[PDB]
């Protein structure tokens, strides 16, 4: 009667990538069909299954005979990493009615997940004709919504004689009752396709698909969410692992309406307000992306097995991309700072004599639920100077702004809910475009 023991006791299928192969590890290893164009994209720890809108990428599961009848009178749930591209305004007005069933038991009845417009919806097809739906009206705040290309989780906590619920990140976000049904002779085929979609560039990426032969409870599903969230790798914004030597823009976590901006050649950084878009006509609004400064993350000194995957807590440099010329961040000695403990940041300070602390290290310390990333800055003698944080203060003659800092003072707030030195790493990704 413990969390993880019941967790691994109730799972009755586990679709998981293992060395370019998809297979079930739930003991009841059932058929895992695959087709030449069932591509797989970068995954948190490994790879990530993909889908494309045509008859190519079917991944169906002919399940075991004994468990074929699993859904006759039993409650259950689905769970998986999910993300869909940002449906643009144009494609939105184009396809704001299409209702394609990603996961289903069609032919030809039973539980059937469906994605339509900006909605996820359970659809259950029982014997006597009755049907219940549990819509989730879109989270209108796209920039943190649940169909915004954010790697996110979903669970559908079906219960026959009780309610079924949906859970995003574990949190509740919508529900509706189910009772008043009958026995279902549900078929066994488990389609994973963009069935009857109407957009060519539509694609849903399911990861770590699993089913549990019983109901659940909020506490253990939160623990489960955490469990899947391995600390092992150090995710970027979208959820896929960070990439060394690839472009990145960076966004504070309590400054969504902000983003980064260089001031001058080789001198200090600073922050600024939010360029974005707002379709107040289709309840759509989101901070625009890819706009700010481009950043390159290297290893400090090359290695033999140079895989761009970043492990937790690895020593790195930090180069900024500018006119496709590279420039490194840092802090030169005697670098004028705030309170002498909040070290101002710099970029490749072309000092004739003065050296420059160029030795940083990606470090994960907080936010085991949300995909943030803290950056640390050491000296050249292995001493913690602080994290790159948000702390006000004017300098010289120019006006006061928000500047990037380094202050071990931050280390005394790591238990808080909101910090000032947590960060987002957005890479230039397909499934989101500033309309």
């Amino acid at each position, epitope marked *: 009667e413990d969390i993880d023991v019941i967790l691994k006791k109730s799972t009755i299928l586990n679709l998981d990538i293992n060395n370019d192969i998809i297979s079930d590890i739930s003991g009841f290893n059932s058929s895992v069909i695959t087709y030449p164009d069932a591509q797989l994209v970068p995954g948190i720890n490994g790879k990530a299954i993909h889908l494309v809108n045509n008859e190519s990428s079917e991944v169906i599961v002919h399940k075991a005979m004994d468990i074929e009848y699993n859904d006759m009178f039993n409650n259950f749930t689905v769970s998986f990493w999910l993300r869909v591209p940002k449906v643009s305004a144009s494609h939105l007005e184009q396809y704001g009615t299409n209702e394609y069933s990603i996961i289903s038991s069609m032919k030809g009845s039973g539980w059937s997940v469906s994605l339509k417009g900006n909605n996820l919806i359970w659809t259950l097809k029982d014997s006597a004709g009755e049907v219940r739906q549990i819509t989730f009206r879109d989270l209108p705040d796209k920039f943190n919504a649940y169909l915004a290309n954010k790697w996110v989780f979903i669970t559908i906590t079906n219960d026959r004689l009780s309610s079924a619920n949906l859970y995003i990140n574990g949190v509740l976000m919508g529900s509706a009752e189910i009772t008043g049904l009958g026995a279902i002779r549900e078929d066994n085929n488990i389609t994973l396709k963009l069935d009857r979609c109407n957009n060519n560039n539509q694609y849903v990426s399911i990861d770590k698909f699993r089913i549990f032969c019983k109901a659940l409870n909020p506490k253990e599903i939160e623990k489960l969410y955490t469990s899947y969230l391995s600390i092992t790798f150090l995710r970027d914004f979208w959820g896929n692992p960070l990439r060394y030597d690839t472009e990145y823009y960076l966004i504070p976590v309590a400054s969504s309406s902000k983003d980064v901006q260089l001031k*001058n050649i080789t001198d200090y950084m600073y922050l600024t307000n939010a360029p974005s878009y707002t379709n107040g006509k289709l309840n759509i609004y989101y901070r625009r992306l890819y706009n700010g400064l481009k950043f390159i993350i290297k290893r400090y000194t090359p290695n033999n097995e140079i895989d761009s995957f970043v492990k937790s807590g690895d020593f790195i440099k930090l180069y900024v991309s500018y006119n496709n010329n590279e420039h490194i961040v840092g802090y030169p000695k005697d670098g004028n700072a705030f309170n002498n403990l909040d070290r101002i940041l710099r970029v490749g300070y072309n000092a004739p004599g003065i050296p420059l602390y160029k030795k940083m290290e990606a470090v994960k310390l907080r936010d085991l639920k949300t995909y943030s990333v803290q950056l640390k800055l050491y000296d050249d003698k292995n001493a913690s100077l602080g994290l790159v944080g948000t702390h006000n203060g004017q300098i010289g003659n120019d006006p006061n702004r928000d500047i990037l800092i380094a202050s071990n003072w931050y280390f005394n707030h790591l238990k808080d809910k909101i910090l000032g030195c947590d960060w987002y790493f957005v890479p230039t990704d397909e499934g989101w475009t500033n309309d």
Partner: antibody, heavy 118, light 108 residues
Framework: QLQLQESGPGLVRPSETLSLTCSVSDDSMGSSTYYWAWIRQPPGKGLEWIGNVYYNGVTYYNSSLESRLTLSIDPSKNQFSLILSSVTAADTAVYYC??????????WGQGTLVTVSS | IMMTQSPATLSVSPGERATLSCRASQSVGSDLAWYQQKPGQAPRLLIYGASYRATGIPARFSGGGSGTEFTLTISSMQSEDFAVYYCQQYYNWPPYTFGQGTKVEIKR
């Protein structure tokens, strides 16, 4: 010390072209990372601006005033210019391109008036 | 919404205190700027974040407020330093969509 100093003098006839060059001077580096935007000024009236485009050149402020004017950059002399065509007399004005240094149009220049006469 | 001047008036004499106002929505609850415009030349800024002046600007000006709705005051005015002002917003492609007007007045 950034003395904005613009040119493109004269008057324009309707539906013709206007060249408007925003020569930012004495700032050798100049275009480092901050924006640049334009200002519309119909004499004795409210003030909506025109646009704002970066030297990466993503886009400019597109309310219902684009598709007749266009914004340009030139990191050569830190310069950047304004394209104008298919204009009516309703925009006879004195325009202002100004340094949006760190997202506030702090230093402004002499500028010059444009007369869409006939 | 966007900006609306509530009110849009002014009645002052040499020496007294100016009183202006604005109104808007607050989804970007950003402290903002105020622009003066001497007639003889191009306009310029007076404040930003309603409190922080820029260089060369004597501190006799100020302002404050909450959300994005803001007001400001100016004490000890000299006729030589008087003209219509303007208040901002934060559109998410930001330059700042201007306030309609701040009608001014010299008292005789």
């Amino acid at each position: 010390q950034l003395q904005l100093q613009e040119s493109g003098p004269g008057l324009v006839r309707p539906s013709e072209t206007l060249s408007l060059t925003c020569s930012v001077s004495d700032d050798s580096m100049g275009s480092s990372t901050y924006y640049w935007a334009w200002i519309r000024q119909p004499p004795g009236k409210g003030l909506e601006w025109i646009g704002n485009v970066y030297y990466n050149g993503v886009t400019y402020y597109n309310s219902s005033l684009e598709s007749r004017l266009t914004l340009s950059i030139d990191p050569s002399k830190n310069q950047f210019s304004l394209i104008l065509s298919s204009v009516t007399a309703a925009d006879t004005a004195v325009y202002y391109c100004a340094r949006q240094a760190d997202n506030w149009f702090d230093p402004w220049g002499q500028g010059t008036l444009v007369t869409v006469s006939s | 919404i966007m900006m609306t001047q509530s009110p849009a008036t002014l009645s002052v004499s040499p020496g007294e205190r100016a009183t202006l106002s604005c109104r808007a929505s607050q989804s970007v609850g950003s402290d903002l700027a105020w622009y003066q415009q001497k007639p003889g030349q191009a306009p310029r800024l007076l404040i930003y974040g309603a409190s922080y002046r820029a260089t060369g600007i004597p501190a006799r000006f100020s302002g404050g407020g909450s959300g994005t709705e803001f007001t400001l005051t100016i004490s000890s005015m000299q006729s030589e330093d008087f003209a219509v002002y303007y208040c901002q917003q934060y559109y998410n492609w930001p330059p700042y969509t201007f306030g309609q007007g701040t009608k001014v007045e010299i008292k005789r």
